[PDB]
């Protein structure tokens, strides 16, 4: 049973030091992505984001790409740094930077395209890393993430759809317990001269809900009046089975994982307070709200962003796990006790596709949460070895037609047969692009980019495959 509501937003999402280059034009100062690409090792290419898609010299161009696909909604990301070079604020803004994106947004709904803009998607200006280390400091990050927040709500009032944060998962257990993503943090001195993995990002975590929350209060009391629209946070998280269906105990593991993985952030939201599961593993080392942070972060989602894309086998593990742990004692797998997979292999080590799992989560995110309104604001794929790949190949890109198919028609199934009510879905990406640590050799595009002959866009199959999949299932009326 499959049926999506008539006001169904679909479209793309992609994030800005992924696509937009000009790392210096306009008055943009160096964001924390910026310092660690020029660390070597740190990316898998020896790449960054400098060039990238060239995006930001070629809005007209994307958006009339948009338009050809047929999207109605479009997700990015607002550069802070392009609007504070410094970030904070008692810095300089750069009004060009503004005017761009102030444009950018204009251009985009004179083509019938609907914006979801996300404040912050891991760009953090590196002044305030430097200054205070950035999430680490929880009244002055908060301070400047309010700052700029309002500048941009005063700015783009058009926009009615506001992310404040991009996957704060990744920003804290990434950038602060493994170093993988930036500002590279951990316990291991061979990799950082600064970091405690086991304490720094439950501090990070922390934070950025306060200042999450501060920022929608903000747009809550002074702009939502006047301007209307909306605001929620962007939380990513996947899908979970036992690795012995028979054991109680991975089958309580498989809520747990979820429980570290998403409402570590999504509990302080809903209910003002971390789930009990990991308080207990954790102890001091996790914080804790003061009455007048409950109160603040407490019912701080207007909507649920849900970034999603891959499930794992849970196993559970015996004893007191080390200090080092954020999964919650218990492991994750590809593969059962039965010998069955979660699916076939992509270029991403930790991406298997599973639209079941989709479906399932969902349910559970649904049923945890009192069934708020969900926009879906990331699903996609890579495809293994296609870096590599002959131009017509990379094009005839069925394995990714059949992941956006599983997974859109799973979500459908989630609304009409099983309640949840998702009212968007954006396809990560509109174009191939920087992919983090793992830089270029990653492509989760819809659309090939030929970095070689001056980033040319080539829609693959899976960017025309979305608009009749979503005639099939969007209601009329």
């Given at each position: 049973?499959?049926?999506?509501?008539?006001?169904f937003?679909?479209?793309?999402?992609?994030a800005?030091?992924?696509?937009?280059?000009?790392?210096?034009?306009?008055?943009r100062?160096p964001?924390?992505?910026?310092?660690?690409?020029?660390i070597?090792?740190?990316?898998?290419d020896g790449s960054?984001?400098?060039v990238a898609c060239?995006?930001?010299?070629?809005t007209?161009?994307?958006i009339?790409?948009?338009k050809?696909?047929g999207?109605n909604?479009?997700?990015?990301?607002?550069?802070?740094?392009?609007?504070?070079?410094?970030?904070?604020?008692?810095?300089p803004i750069?009004?060009?930077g503004?005017?761009?994106?102030?444009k950018?947004?204009?251009d985009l709904?004179?083509?019938?395209?609907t914006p979801?803009?996300?404040?912050?998607?891991?760009?953090?200006p590196?002044?305030?890393?430097?200054?205070?280390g950035g999430?680490?400091?929880?009244?002055?990050?908060?301070?400047?993430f309010?700052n700029?927040?309002?500048?941009?709500?005063?700015?783009?009032?058009?926009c009615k759809?506001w992310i404040?944060?991009?996957?704060?998962?990744?920003?804290?257990?990434?950038?602060?317990?493994?170093?993988?993503?930036?500002?590279?943090?951990?316990?291991?001195?061979?990799?950082?001269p600064?970091?405690?993995?086991?304490?720094?990002?439950?501090?990070?975590?922390?934070?950025?809900?306060?200042?999450?929350?501060?920022?929608?209060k903000a747009?809550?009391?002074?702009?939502?009046?006047?301007?209307?629209?909306?605001?929620?946070?962007?939380?990513?998280?996947?899908?979970?089975?036992?690795?012995?269906?028979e054991?109680?105990?991975?089958?309580?593991?498989?809520?747990?994982?979820?429980?570290?993985?998403?409402s570590?952030?999504?509990?302080?939201?809903?209910?003002?307070?971390?789930?009990?599961?990991m308080?207990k593993?954790?102890?001091?080392?996790?914080?804790?709200?003061?009455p007048?942070?409950?109160?603040?972060?407490?019912?701080?989602?207007?909507?649920?962003?849900?970034?999603?894309?891959?499930?794992?086998?849970?196993?559970?593990?015996?004893?007191?796990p080390?200090e080092?742990?954020?999964?919650?004692?218990?492991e994750?797998?590809?593969?059962?006790?039965?010998?069955?997979?979660?699916?076939?292999?992509?270029?991403?080590?930790w991406?298997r596709?599973?639209?079941q799992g989709?479906?399932?989560?969902?349910?559970?995110l649904?049923?945890?949460?009192?069934?708020?309104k969900i926009?879906?604001?990331?699903?996609?794929?890579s495809?293994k070895?296609?870096?590599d790949m002959?131009?017509?190949?990379?094009?005839?890109?069925?394995?990714?037609?059949?992941?956006?198919?599983?997974?859109?028609?799973?979500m459908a199934?989630?609304?009409?047969?099983?309640?949840?009510?998702?009212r968007?879905?954006?396809?990560?990406?509109?174009?191939?692009?920087?992919?983090?640590?793992?830089?270029?050799?990653?492509r989760?595009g819809?659309?090939?980019?030929?970095?070689?002959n001056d980033q040319?866009?080539?829609?693959?199959k899976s960017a025309?495959?979305?608009?009749?999949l979503f005639?099939?299932?969007?209601?009329?009326?």
């Amino acid at each position: 049973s499959m049926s999506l509501p008539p006001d169904f937003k679909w479209g793309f999402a992609t994030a800005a030091y992924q696509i937009e280059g000009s790392v210096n034009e306009d008055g943009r100062g160096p964001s924390i992505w910026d310092t660690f690409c020029a660390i070597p090792g740190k990316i898998a290419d020896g790449s960054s984001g400098a060039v990238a898609c060239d995006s930001y010299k070629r809005t007209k161009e994307d958006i009339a790409l948009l338009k050809e696909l047929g999207a109605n909604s479009y997700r990015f990301s607002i550069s802070w740094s392009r609007i504070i070079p410094l970030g904070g604020r008692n810095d300089p803004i750069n009004q060009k930077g503004i005017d761009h994106y102030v444009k950018f947004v204009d251009d985009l709904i004179e083509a019938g395209i609907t914006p979801f803009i996300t404040l912050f998607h891991w760009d953090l200006p590196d002044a305030l890393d430097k200054r205070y280390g950035g999430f680490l400091n929880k009244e002055e990050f908060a301070a400047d993430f309010e700052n700029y927040a309002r500048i941009m709500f005063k700015a783009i009032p058009k926009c009615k759809h506001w992310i404040t944060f991009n996957e704060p998962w990744c920003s804290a257990i990434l950038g602060y317990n493994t170093g993988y993503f930036a500002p590279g943090h951990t316990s291991d001195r061979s990799k950082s001269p600064v970091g405690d993995s086991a304490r720094e990002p439950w501090i990070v975590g922390h934070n950025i809900l306060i200042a999450h929350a501060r920022a929608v209060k903000a747009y809550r009391e002074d702009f939502k009046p006047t301007q209307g629209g909306e605001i929620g946070i962007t939380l990513n998280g996947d899908a979970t089975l036992p690795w012995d269906p028979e054991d109680p105990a991975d089958i309580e593991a498989c809520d747990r994982k979820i429980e570290f993985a998403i409402s570590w952030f999504a509990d302080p939201i809903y209910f003002g307070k971390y789930p009990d599961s990991m308080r207990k593993q954790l102890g001091d080392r996790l914080p804790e709200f003061t009455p007048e942070e409950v109160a603040l972060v407490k019912g701080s989602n207007d909507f649920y962003g849900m970034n999603h894309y891959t499930a794992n086998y849970i196993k559970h593990k015996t004893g007191v796990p080390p200090e080092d742990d954020f999964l919650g004692n218990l492991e994750t797998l590809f593969y059962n006790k039965y010998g069955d997979c979660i699916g076939p292999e992509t270029q991403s080590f930790w991406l298997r596709p599973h639209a079941q799992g989709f479906r399932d989560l969902l349910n559970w995110l649904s049923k945890r949460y009192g069934y708020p309104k969900i926009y879906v604001t990331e699903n996609g794929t890579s495809l293994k070895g296609e870096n590599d790949m002959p131009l017509e190949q990379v094009l005839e890109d069925d394995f990714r037609v059949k992941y956006f198919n599983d997974y859109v028609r799973a979500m459908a199934a989630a609304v009409a047969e099983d309640g949840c009510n998702v009212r968007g879905y954006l396809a990560w990406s509109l174009l191939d692009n920087f992919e983090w640590a793992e830089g270029y050799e990653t492509r989760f595009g819809v659309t090939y980019v030929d970095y070689a002959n001056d980033q040319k866009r080539y829609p693959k199959k899976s960017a025309k495959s979305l608009k009749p999949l979503f005639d099939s299932l969007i209601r009329k009326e």
